Design a protein around this nucleic acid. Structure first.
Ligand SMILES: [Mg+2]
Ligand SMILES: [Mg+2]
Ligand SMILES: [Mg+2]
Ligand SMILES: [Mg+2]
Ligand SMILES: [Mg+2]
Ligand SMILES: [Mg+2]
Ligand SMILES: [Mg+2]
Ligand SMILES: [Mg+2]
Ligand SMILES: [Mg+2]
Ligand SMILES: [Mg+2]
Ligand SMILES: [Mg+2]
Ligand SMILES: [Mg+2]
Ligand SMILES: [Mg+2]
Ligand SMILES: [Mg+2]
Ligand SMILES: [Mg+2]
Ligand SMILES: [Mg+2]
Ligand SMILES: [Mg+2]
Ligand SMILES: [Mg+2]
Ligand SMILES: [Mg+2]
Ligand SMILES: [Mg+2]
Ligand SMILES: [Mg+2]
Ligand SMILES: [Mg+2]
Ligand SMILES: [Mg+2]
Lengths: 153, 67, 70, 117
RNA sequence: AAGGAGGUAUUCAUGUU
RNA sequence: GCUUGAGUCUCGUAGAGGGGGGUAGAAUUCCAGGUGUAGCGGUGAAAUGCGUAGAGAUCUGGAGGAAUACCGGUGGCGAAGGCGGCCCCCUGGACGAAGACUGACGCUCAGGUGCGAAAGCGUGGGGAGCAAACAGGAUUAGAUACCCUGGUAGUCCACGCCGUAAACGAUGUCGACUUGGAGGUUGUGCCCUUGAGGCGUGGCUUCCGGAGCUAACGCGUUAAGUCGACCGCCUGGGGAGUACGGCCGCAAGGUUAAAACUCAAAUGAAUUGACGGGGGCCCGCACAAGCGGUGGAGCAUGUGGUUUAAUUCGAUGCAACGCGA
């Protein structure tokens, strides 16, 4: 908006976990407004991931999310007539959103059968730092370093 | 402001007076403008002639990348 | 613009000091103006126009500093 | 091979390209590096980053001589003009002098004509 | 290159630096 | 006859005013040598070009030509063109102070004479850099250009010729009178210079502005105001500053300067819009950040086209095409 500085909409916490971050994850996963199905998938995936990789669902989810969070991204400025790909530091709320979005899309792509199984596998893989999501994060970091020469435009 | 020469009623710069010329030159060796220094126009011209004569006699450097 | 690193002087401070010295010397401006040959007519015209612009805005400020903005 | 532990870094920084040359105090050149050798071409070789990597390449080249002290002579109106100095400091030489040696004429030869673009 | 301040711009002890 | 206009003398002041001759440092180029090695150079991007016979870079020495950074200033000087490192020689003008002197010796000026940027011409030198022409590489539909790499006349010097410029303040020279303000520059008088100050009195110069003038724009004590003296020039636009003739010129050409024919306008200033690959400011799912699509498949539907005896007619950039229906 040219003239509007209202912030972000207040979102309610997750019923079964009281986590705003988890609620946003459910919203990102949800498609066609079918929140019940997405919530069941994430709950089952979290329980499976907890049993496999550690102690509690929130701890496993946060460690995976941190392993996927990007420090810096790149945007396309246009000052010298041509377009310069310049790196830019991402604000923390955007870090969480990008991490969750990357995890969800990577899980969708995977070839496993059940969506909950795909989500649990991807979360564990991201925690172990071999997943497609962490690969995506490393790719964006790699490109940012490549075009770091334009960091003062 | 505060033209120094007219304060003492100086008639001529007397280029042999190096210390005054050192005040009225920059570190790089060029002449500081009268706009910055505050010197009057007549004394500025006399000062420029004195500095150039001193540069020829090698009492002042033309530049700092000379010797 | 000769600069020698002073005793107990940080390198970043020294580098900023060197840039300040170069700015005061006016080296980049001089070489850039000497990059191409400006005709004497162009030089005189440019100088005169700049003086006119400076004088005009001085008068404008000194006059319009006696008006009600609101 | 003959260790001297003090060098002079001549940084010729033109608009198009930057050439860094490490030499002895007397004038004999030890090693050099340029953005063209760094691989950047044209619009990318006229950037400060290319100058930085060329300075790093030159520092590696003259690493055999084991030079510790380094006085810097920067010359020409080049895009970087400073990234080379930062790169040398990062490479780990003690920068002794930072000197500008741009050749400014006292109204000498006539420059080429102005470009009409 | 971008933002802030002062002016038509300097006096603002030298020393120090 | 007189001294107020004009001029002379006495003492000083500032100035890139002019001519001649030396000299200084920076820088470019080239040459010789050392170090050192694979790029340099150039552009929006490239190539031509240069470099392994060693470039570019870096250091040392040498040669040569041209021009004088900073100071530098809507600062100064000159009739105008124009004049910019420093020093010396020759030389012109302007201004201030106090007086003394001559006694209208003044102003303007057709012909005439001289000076007169740059380019150009003749003869002879010089030649670093720059650079018409030219050569090559690009760009483009074409590119006899803009861009890039080279590059000859020329630019420099001596002596002649040329004599034209938006040679412009687009404002002829001389003189007198008419409210002001802020500056710059250069003299000079007085007041305790109460220390950089205060009050006068000249010369030149920039801006703003009153009356007045002007078509308006604007000028405005440096007039485009109110007047006086002399000179030059205009008579609608094109044809045309062209033809012919004369004069000048080595030439290029310059100067003086028409007519037929043709049109009913050509022009100046200012006004309201629209536009600008002008400038500032602002807004809109305009972009950006996101989610979901269309464009691929099948089918439904509308249109175009083609076909038909008829495929009824209309809507057909956005703002027609599941529209009238
Ligand atoms: Mg060029
Ligand atoms: Mg004058
Ligand atoms: Mg006559
Ligand atoms: Mg000529
Ligand atoms: Mg000739
Ligand atoms: Mg000749
Ligand atoms: Mg050319
Ligand atoms: Mg050339
Ligand atoms: Mg004429
Ligand atoms: Mg003229
Ligand atoms: Mg005329
Ligand atoms: Mg006359
Ligand atoms: Mg006026
Ligand atoms: Mg004629
Ligand atoms: Mg003509
Ligand atoms: Mg004739
Ligand atoms: Mg809306
Ligand atoms: Mg979009
Ligand atoms: Mg289709
Ligand atoms: Mg159609
Ligand atoms: Mg129809
Ligand atoms: Mg129809
Ligand atoms: Mg519709």
């Amino acid at each position: 908006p040219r003239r509007r500085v209202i912030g972000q909409r207040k979102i309610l916490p997750d019923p079964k976990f009281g986590s705003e971050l988890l609620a946003k994850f459910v919203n990102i996963l949800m498609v066609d407004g079918k929140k019940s199905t997405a919530e069941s998938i994430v709950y089952s995936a979290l329980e499976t991931l907890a049993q496999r990789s550690g102690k509690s669902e929130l701890e496993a989810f946060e460690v995976a999310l941190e392993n996927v969070r990007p420090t810096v991204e790149v945007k396309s400025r246009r000052v010298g007539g041509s377009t310069y790909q310049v790196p830019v530091e991402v604000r923390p709320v955007r870090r969480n959103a990008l991490a969750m979005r990357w995890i969800v899309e990577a899980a969708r792509k995977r070839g496993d059968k059940s969506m909950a199984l795909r989500l649990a596998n991807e979360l564990s893989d991201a925690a172990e730092n071999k997943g497609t999501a962490v690969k995506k994060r490393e790719d964006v970091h790699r490109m940012a370093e490549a075009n770091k020469a334009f960091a003062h435009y | 402001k505060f033209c120094r020469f007219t304060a003492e009623g100086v008639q001529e710069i007397d280029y042999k007076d190096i210390a005054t010329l050192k005040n009225y030159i920059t570190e790089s060796g060029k002449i500081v403008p009268s706009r910055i220094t505050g010197t009057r126009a007549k004394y500025q011209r006399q000062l420029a002639r004195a500095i150039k004569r001193a540069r020829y006699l090698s009492l002042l450097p033309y530049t700092d990348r000379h010797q | 613009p000769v600069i020698k690193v002073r005793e107990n002087e940080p390198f970043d401070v020294a580098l900023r000091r060197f840039k300040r010295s170069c700015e005061k010397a006016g080296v980049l401006a001089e070489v850039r103006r000497r990059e191409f040959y400006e005709k004497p007519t162009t030089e005189r015209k440019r100088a005169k126009a700049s003086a006119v612009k400076r004088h005009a805005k001085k008068l404008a400020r000194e006059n319009a500093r006696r008006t009600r903005l609101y | 091979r003959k260790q001297v532990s003090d060098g002079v870094a001549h940084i010729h920084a033109s608009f198009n390209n930057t050439i860094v040359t490490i030499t002895d105090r007397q004038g004999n050149a030890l090693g050099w590096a340029t953005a063209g050798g760094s691989g950047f071409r044209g619009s990318r070789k006229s950037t400060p980053f290319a100058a930085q990597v060329a300075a790093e390449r030159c520092a590696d080249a003259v690493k055999e001589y084991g030079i510790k002290n380094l006085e810097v002579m920067v010359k020409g109106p080049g895009p970087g003009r400073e990234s080379t100095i930062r790169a040398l400091n990062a490479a780990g030489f003690r920068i002794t002098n930072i000197t500008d040696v741009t050749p400014i004429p006292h109204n000498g030869c006539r420059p080429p004509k102005k470009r009409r673009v």
